[PDB]
Design an enzyme around this catalytic site. Structure first.
Site, mmCIF file in Angstrom:
data_model
loop_
_atom_site.group_PDB
_atom_site.id
_atom_site.type_symbol
_atom_site.label_atom_id
_atom_site.label_comp_id
_atom_site.label_asym_id
_atom_site.label_seq_id
_atom_site.Cartn_x
_atom_site.Cartn_y
_atom_site.Cartn_z
ATOM 1 N N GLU A 114 142.319 73.567 69.978
ATOM 2 C CA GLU A 114 142.587 74.523 68.933
ATOM 3 C C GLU A 114 143.818 74.261 68.082
ATOM 4 O O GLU A 114 143.871 74.795 66.981
ATOM 5 C CB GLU A 114 142.701 75.930 69.538
ATOM 6 C CG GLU A 114 141.429 76.306 70.286
ATOM 7 C CD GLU A 114 140.292 76.738 69.407
ATOM 8 O OE1 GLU A 114 140.548 76.746 68.119
ATOM 9 O OE2 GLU A 114 139.241 77.034 69.869
ATOM 10 N N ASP A 156 139.880 78.976 59.966
ATOM 11 C CA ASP A 156 139.263 78.143 60.967
ATOM 12 C C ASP A 156 138.154 77.246 60.357
ATOM 13 O O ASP A 156 137.958 77.217 59.149
ATOM 14 C CB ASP A 156 138.828 78.910 62.186
ATOM 15 C CG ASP A 156 137.566 79.736 62.074
ATOM 16 O OD1 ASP A 156 136.922 79.688 60.966
ATOM 17 O OD2 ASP A 156 137.141 80.368 62.986
#
Ligand SMILES: [Cl-]
Ligand SMILES: [Cl-]
Length: 162
Positions: free
Chosen positions: A11, A20
């Site tokens: 991440e 994202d």
């Protein structure tokens, strides 16, 4: 290696609101804020999550705190899920981290949808599960991360992460 280190690699860490891979407002270590297109709606979720007026920026400690909550929530979600629990219980430690990673990324509902792959993992048909897992939007959209998780299921080792 452990689940935290694994997810930190997958991440990354960002201290300012960002989008994202799906275009959604996120912050920290993969912490989704909202699916809404509004940056204001994201700053509002952020302040509520942190308990202060952040103006869209957080500290490393705050990022790590959300991260701890999110991993804990993913694990608890798996343990509460009638479909996921039995798979998790059947796996070794390494592969359990792989399953947590998928849940952290796409949520419990999403993973519970991989019916056939779940069955194959539970039966310990590693090669076959690996092939079936790759036939998914997940794999096509985030292939490098998917390959790392899939290799973890296939081998039962952390090789894709070292
Ligand atoms: Cl939260
Ligand atoms: Cl990727």
């Amino acid at each position: 290696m452990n689940i935290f280190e694994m997810l930190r690699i997958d991440e990354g860490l960002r201290l300012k609101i960002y989008k994202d891979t799906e275009g959604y407002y996120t912050i920290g270590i993969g912490h989704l804020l909202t699916k809404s297109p509004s940056l204001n709606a994201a700053k509002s979720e952020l302040d509520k999550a942190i308990g202060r007026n952040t103006n869209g920026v957080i500290t490393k400690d705050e990022a790590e705190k959300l991260f701890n909550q999110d991993v804990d929530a993913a694990v608890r979600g798996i343990l509460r899920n009638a479909k996921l629990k039995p798979v998790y219980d059947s796996l070794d430690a390494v592969r359990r981290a792989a399953l947590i990673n998928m849940v952290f990324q796409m949520g419990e509902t999403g993973v519970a949808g991989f019916t056939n792959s779940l069955r194959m993992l539970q039966q310990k048909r590693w090669d076959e599960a690996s092939v079936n897992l790759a036939k998914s939007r997940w794999y096509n959209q985030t292939p490098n991360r998917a390959k790392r998780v899939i290799t973890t299921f296939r081998t039962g080792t952390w090789d894709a992460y070292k």
